[PDB]
Swiss-Prot record, chains A, B:
Optimum pH is 8.0. Gene3D superfamilies: 3.40.50.11380, Glycogen Phosphorylase B, Tetratricopeptide repeat domain. TPR repeats lie at residues 1-33, 34-67, 69-101, 109-142, 143-176, 177-210, 218-251, 252-285, 286-319, 321-353, 354-387. This is Probable UDP-N-acetylglucosamine--peptide N-acetylglucosaminyltransferase SPINDLY. Pfam families: Glyco_transf_41 (PF13844), TPR_1 (PF00515), TPR_10 (PF13374), TPR_16 (PF13432), TPR_8 (PF13181). GO terms for cellular component: cytoplasm; nucleus. It comes from Arabidopsis thaliana (Mouse-ear cress).
Length: 803, 803
């Protein structure tokens, strides 16, 4: 008995060779020793001598058929070769011999699970399920059987059974990472993400390098961060995206969403970096390219923005947003035909993209197609009735061709103001001490303090302003400053005014700023044009609100008290109703300050070139078909005449061709018309007036700055009187320069005046050489008289408010 | 005269065909019209009819040889074909005709610069330079000539001339981006980075898509961020790295340095992400892999850390830091031979890497090579005399083989404490009200509150503590908690103690925490072992400072007042000097709390196996060669005996083989010794005591917890008395269990006692079955008596401090 026990101890100490030799020496003495046969079989198994182990166990079973141990080891040997059926039978025999032999029960549950899996992969799922239940009847603890049951239930969309099976599997084996992973995947599939996250956390606590769980954790965390961001907590969303990038460092979607979140935070450099990284890891992320193009466009890197949009469209050709943004950039670049084609494709891709309709209307307005622009604006308001940009661009466009014949323009503006007031709260009390004989704070607010038409007039008061009585505050919304902006700032400061840069600010806070500065009269210089601050004007921050030159009609805002004009642009008997009270200055409402780059007046080209040249440097939006027909009538009335028209959209060949067609259809030879694009130079723009002899003013929207520049170069400008301020601005200037005999009341006398002026080249030449001195001695250049008049008007308005 | 002028106007209007036809009709009338010849030549040039233009200009020159215009256009035609010499000659002729003809001068400066460039590329740099100076004599404004001059000067390392040339080039052309770029590159090369940055900013303002300037801006910004970080402002450095990543989104070095900066900020998730991204964009960034491995190691992801270090070493095989870190990880993994090889390679790569020497000493200590460990520690102190870890590991290692024979161990500890006090400030005043008969606040501070040897003793007071008089505060520095930590917390809280988790905190702030809690007696349980808080003890936060079990010798800190012991471990006449005052408890200084997993005592294996089994479960560091020789003497003295030794390092085959060699050299058959590695189970570790009959205690470092566990399983433990506490701990336990007849004073009686115990298997078996009851009735398990004794000692110490 000591030898068998010693051999068993040796076997248990992995000293298989000496124990084997002892079992051999015992079997030489007793070939019927079943236990020695079992020990021999086990020791041969450990030497990978399967056949001889099988022989030893077969002989043991022959000696003791009810040896559950020998039958179990025979089943194990059968199992290792994958011959599962005989092994299963052997285990069944072992249980019949000793139903308490736990190792046989456990191994039988294993092999029964393998059998069930084999049938499952063969599509025999239901009988496999029954054998898995048999396994759990044999060993209610074999967790892998629960895992397999959960997988099967998850394949038949029976998620509740799958969860119950995975929960049982995790109970029997707490470190069964795959069960937690599959639970997390199912819970993610059910919409609940916190549970899924918890399951993945359990998986990674059990298996920290299980990649599938890391990837799914990053996905679930990104979805959760997106939800939480949509719920308002953007910072916690960002935290979730960063934690997601911890498990999946290349998850491009988390980078894209970080880009978006940082964009909303105004951390544009990070938004750019993250969007570009998202594109690097996911090149099919056309949204990243689109948003990157947007950020580059707002950084004024238009070429990069174009590249980004072209990439987005090469990935998603129908990506309506990229189409619209590319159209907008081409509009900025002046590629009008490409802009049109892009915007039209965006509209085709999404007929409810209101902003695309607004941009189309803007493009048509710039192209002079006022009617189509209005139609597009009407479609936009049909889609977005609160589209502020569409409404204001609509009003502006209607100002170019709406001749005073009814109360529709006024109605539209008035209604516009009513709606905004019902949608924009304002103040009702002011702490400004009501003293009529004290200093007054004047705010001038405008986005165009650079080389713009408005600047050529606001320069006059800025230069001629009695600072000892009227403290000046400037609210510059300029997008891009320049030498003229700096000159204005220096002029205001050198006297004692206040300059505030307000580009990129809110509106209500600007109204607060106006209140802290105790502005008494706030003067808006923009009206319904781009980047206006009419919302600040709606807040009523100042006790007196004025408009003056940015818009040639009523603002329609009931909160604006007064509009400054004179008795020539708006005669006392004008029938055009306006929301503002008209205050008429005694002289011209305009004071032109010439550019110090105007250069000399040249002699009249007609003396040297032998031809009369009419011209117009107005935008195409002012060149209405009526004006086109009138100019054709003039040029037919003046034998051998030439017309020079310079407009930015003539950079596009299609626009030139269409304009030529229009003219030719009126009987005018295209060879007689020279269409020049914009030349980006103040000096050269002014010198271009040497190319024309007679300026033709536009109607019903006259020139304003263009007429003044024309006159400064000695080019007579024929205008027409009419029923709207925009028409009579030319009347005011020509009359105050002393050319009131050149203001027509209608088209026929306008033709007659143009032919008469063209008929006396000598009178034309003397006028050319006299016009600079005539204007410089006139009120249009009399800065001091204009300043005293404006100052008096301001004082009068203050007095009106005081009572 | 009107026809020529009209043709010139037509040419100026790009109506080249009609003007050409008019010039032809004029030349039919006057073939000598030089101006008509020039106009024809120009119009043919615009149709790319070079040969016919050349004919027209040649005839013009024949008609007017001094026509500077015709000569200039001939030079232009020559220039377009690249036949620069004749063109230059033609321009020289034009200047001789009319030295004021500016277009000829400008074009001549251009062609002279091209000639200079041609000579430069041919290596004829100096004559090219003279022609560039000729160009500047012709046109002092031709900026490209200045640029070329700057390039040439930059090629001859004449940087001041290069800067002057580039500055002149930028003056003549403000939008010459390349000049600013080259200036920035030179300034970067001179060390000044702000100027370079300014130049690149100018370049990108002129050319926002010039890639070279973006890349160089990112480089310069990364260098500047690195400097500023090294200057203390890490946040501004991070801002610079982010701005760098704005211009170069894939600059891997900025990502690596961001990883480092965020690591110093403790934003490890970001440090990981950035280091991995840096590796993605620069796979040769072995430093990123190293630091990523460090972060994964500190996140307990040892397999990933190993992968990262293997990657770093595949990139940089001699990267000493990665070698050291991989060695440390293998030490944690127990791969002792791989750790040794790695640390030795790190030492070979950098012989001044003190930390590598410390880690080598730690490895040798774990391998039991105390002498080599001490040598390595001495080398580390030679390199880093303030290396806290090396000094403490040295003292600990010396405790294993330094037998009390001189005052060197005490001297080393005492000096250690002196130096730290001179390098660690502490407090001198306490607000604790000096009342000897009031409640006392006891702090227990320790990192090992988990399943560790120390826990088996600290459990006793935590269970048996009168909370109504001694408020308990626990400072747990546990790195990884467990069920025993939670059990201790629950036990302390259920009574009214305070539990504070302090893992990962500073030392001085802990001293502040001890002061706010008004701790009266702070008890350190760690001494010079890993992660101790001896620096907190140096701060003297509590009025009374005690050590008790973490270290078997003096701490050497003069700020520690008392060490708790008894009269058996440190007899009253002990000659070992210590900095602490010894307070001897009346009973055993140890109270073992058995594990509730100890299971039953088995019968003595000798009755069933037929062999006597000696054993030892002590670490190899305690198994000194002297002990090895003694055990060999015992086993030779006991015929047919077996030794079982279980130690963790026996997982390494080389350590087993070397140990076997040692034994065999002493005449012991290796077959008689079973070396078992660590089994990671408390139950199975305790049940392993069924494999041995007699425990052999180690010297001069006795077992402590191992001896108690042995006794609880009924295994007698023979110990020896000696001159040091660590030796006499076994004496204390055996005497207090009632086995004082088994405490030897020397090796010969130790052998005699071991043979006598082995000779009576029957007495051995009765002892085995009695030992549990003997100890349970003994003071070692008498929690109440031990608690009253400790409580009395605490009260006495408080009273001593009160006076």
């Amino acid at each position: 008995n000591d030898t068998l026990s010693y051999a068993n101890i040796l076997r248990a100490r992995n000293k298989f060779a000496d124990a084997l030799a002892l079992y051999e020496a015992m079997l030489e003495k007793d070939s019927k020793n079943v236990e020695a046969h079992i020990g021999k079989g086990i020791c041969l198994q450990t030497q990978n001598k399967g056949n001889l182990a099988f022989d030893c166990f077969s002989e043991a079973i022959r000696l003791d058929p009810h040896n559950a141990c020998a039958l179990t080891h025979c089943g194990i040997l059968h199992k290792e070769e994958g011959r599962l059926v005989e092994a299963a039978e052997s285990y069944q025999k072992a249980l019949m011999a000793d139903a308490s032999y736990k190792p046989a029960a456990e191994c039988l549950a294993i092999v029964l699970t393998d059998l069930g899996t084999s049938l499952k992969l063969a599509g025999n799922t239901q009988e496999g399920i029954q054998k898995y239940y048999e396994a759990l009847k044999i060993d209610p603890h074999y967790a892998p059987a629960y895992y397999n049951l959960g997988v099967v239930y998850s394949e038949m969309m029976q998620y509740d059974n799958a969860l119950s099976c995975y929960e049982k599997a995790a109970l029997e084996r707490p470190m069964y990472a795959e069960a937690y992973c599959n639970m997390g995947v199912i819970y993610k599939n059910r919409g609940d993400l916190e549970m899924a996250i918890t399951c993945y956390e359990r998986c990674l606590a059990v298996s920290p390098n299980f990649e599938i769980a890391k990837n799914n954790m990053a996905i679930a965390l990104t979805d959760l961060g997106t939800k939480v961001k949509l719920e308002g907590d953007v910072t916690q969303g960002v935290a979730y995206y960063k934690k997601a990038l911890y498990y999946n460092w290349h998850y491009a979607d988390a980078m894209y969403n970080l880009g978006v979140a940082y964009g909303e935070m105004l951390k544009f450099d990070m938004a750019i970096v993250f969007y570009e990284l998202a594109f690097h890891f996911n090149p099919h992320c056309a949204e990243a390219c689109n948003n990157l193009g947007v950020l580059y466009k707002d950084r004024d890197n238009l070429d990069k923005a174009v590249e980004c949009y072209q990439m987005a469209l090469s990935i998603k050709p129908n990506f309506a947003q990229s189409l619209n943004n590319l159209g907008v950039v081409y509009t900025v670049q002046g590629k009008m035909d490409a802009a049109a084609s892009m915007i039209e494709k965006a509209i085709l891709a999404n007929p409810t993209y209101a902003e695309a309709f607004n941009n189309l209307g803007v493009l048509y307005r710039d192209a002079g197609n006022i009617t189509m622009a209005i139609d597009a604006y009407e479609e936009c308001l049909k889609i977005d009735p609160d589209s502020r940009n569409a409404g204001q661009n609509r009003l502006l466009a209607m100002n170019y061709i709406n001749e005073g014949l009814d109360d529709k323009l006024f109605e539209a503006h008035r209604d516009w103001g009513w709606r905004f007031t019902r949608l924009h709260p304002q103040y009702t009390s002011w702490d400004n001490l009501k003293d009529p004989e004290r200093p007054i704070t004047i705010g001038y607010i405008s986005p165009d303090f650079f080389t713009h038409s408005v600047s050529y007039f606001i320069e006059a008061p800025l230069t001629h302003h009695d600072y000892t009585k009227y403290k000046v505050v400037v609210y510059s919304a300029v997008v891009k400053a320049d030498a003229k902006t700096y000159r204005f700032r220096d002029k205001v400061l050198k006297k004692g005014g206040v300059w505030k840069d307000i580009y990129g600010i809110d509106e209500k806070k600007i109204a607060s700023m106006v209140r802290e500065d105790k502005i008494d009269i706030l003067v808006e210089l923009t009206g319904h044009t781009a980047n206006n601050k009419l919302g600040t004007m709606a807040c009523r921050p100042a006790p007196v609100q004025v408009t003056w030159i940015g818009y040639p009609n009523t603002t329609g805002l009931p909160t604006v008290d007064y509009r400054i004009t004179d008795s020539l642009a708006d005669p006392p008997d004008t029938k055009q109703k306006q929301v503002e009270e008209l205050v008429r200055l005694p002289d011209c409402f305009l004071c032109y300050t010439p550019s110090p780059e105007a250069g000399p007046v040249c002699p009249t080209p007609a003396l040297s070139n032998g031809f009369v040249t009419f011209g117009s440097f107005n935008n195409l939006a002012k060149i209405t078909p009526k004006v086109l027909q009138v100019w054709a009538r003039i040029l037919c009335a003046v034998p051998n005449s030439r017309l020079v028209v310079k407009c930015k959209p003539f950079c596009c060949d299609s626009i030139r061709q269409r304009f030529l067609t229009t003219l030719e259809q009126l009987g005018l030879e295209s060879k007689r018309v020279d269409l020049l694009p914009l030349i980006l130079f103040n000096h050269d723009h002014m010198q271009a007036y040497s190319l024309m002899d007679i300026s033709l003013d536009t109607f019903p929207y006259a020139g304003t700055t263009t007429t003044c520049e024309s006159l400064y170069m000695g080019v007579p400008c024929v205008t027409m009187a009419g029923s709207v301020h925009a028409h009579n601005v030319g009347v005011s200037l020509l009359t105050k320069v002393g050319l009131g005999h050149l203001v027509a009341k209608n088209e026929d006398e306008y033709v007659q005046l143009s032919v008469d002026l063209a008929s006396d080249v000598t009178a034309l030449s003397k006028l050319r050489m006299s016009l600079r001195d005539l204007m410089a001695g006139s009120p249009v250049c009399n800065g001091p008289s204009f300043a005293v008049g404006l100052e008096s008007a301001y004082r009068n308005m203050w007095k009106k408010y005081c009572k």
